[PDB]
């Protein structure tokens, strides 16, 4: 039982770029920098046309614009476009 | 009749974490710190797939990223996942 | 023909509170402070369930959280809940 | 192969105004200032009622409120309202 104000699969990272391209197969590509120095290009598990994709898209965007560390998890397989898929994001004050 | 610029169920709190997990039963879990020191885990009254859930999700997120105090009210019962449900948020400049 | 970086119905104002209450008849009530000192409570022209209401809801929220002056116009009649309805918002860098 | 934290059709610009007007033919007009000093008024490729239009609308808005440079591409033709249409936005931390 920790301090009320202290928080506490999920890797810590920074969201360093997002390219929104709803004309194309990727739809939106997220560039992520992990805490151990590796940089990875990733997609969202859901279509942007689905509200679940919109919700994941928004927390990632806010994390980039606030310059925040976040934690993410992915489905765990590279797809036919060459990227893993983000399916969970955690953000804290 | 108060100063034009002065504002004025609803408890004052801070939104200290949000975990967006649209694969799972909770969908999104909000960690809230009340002004009297108690910390509580909460859900939204509406599905994320519904625009009302999206609207509550956005004001909470903005409150976390701006480091703002807000006021919330809940439906008033713990559900089968162990959490109350947020149904109203008020935010001020 | 003005400087490329210089911008330029619409009244200038600040968005000083927003109360998101999708359980109730108002859905979301916006408290607005006009530049001449009068303060007014206002609704949105569109349902929150409609994407046009969502779009107006988002620019207002961003204006509150960034502490920005904006310009708004309304439909021009008080409705049966006692408020006018915002139908246009302009925001500038 | 560049530094992990270093990023890298698309023109660099600032988003200096947005006018959200879902009553009218334009729906939302974006004023953009390119790096070479020319200023241009632009629309979105998608309807605001479509989630793809909402996604492009949000990254533009965040870019304005964070005072960020971004890159955009357009469809490449002036339409019957006198404007080109934005179809891709890239934003970086």
Residue numbers in the entry:
A (entry chain A), B (entry chain A), C (entry chain A), D (entry chain A): 4 to 11, 20 to 104
Article sentences:
We have succeeded in determining crystal structures of two types of proteins with high-resolution using CFPC.
Crystalline inclusion protein A (CipA), a hydrophobic protein of 104 amino acid residues, spontaneously forms crystalline aggregates in Photorhabdus luminescens, an entomopathogenic bacterium. Since we found that twin crystals are formed when CipA is expressed in E. coli, we applied CFPC to CipA with the addition of twin crystal inhibitors during the crystallization process and succeeded in obtaining suitable crystals and determining the structure of CipA at a 2.11 Å resolution. X-ray diffraction experiments of the crystals showed that CipAC_CF crystallized in the presence of 3 v/v % 1,4-dioxane dramatically reduces the twin fraction to 0.10, with a resolution of 2.11 Å. The structure of the CipA monomer consists of the N-terminal arm followed by three β-strands β1, β2, β3, α-helix, and β-strands β4 and β5. Except for the N-terminal arm, the globular domain is a typical oligonucleotide/oligosaccharide-binding (OB) fold. In the crystal lattice, the four α-helices from each monomer form a four-helix bundle around the crystallographic fourfold symmetry axis and exist as a tetramer. This tetramer is consistent with the results of PISA36 prediction of oligomeric states and is considered the basic unit of crystal growth. CipAC_CF forms a multilayer structure composed of the tetramers as the building blocks.
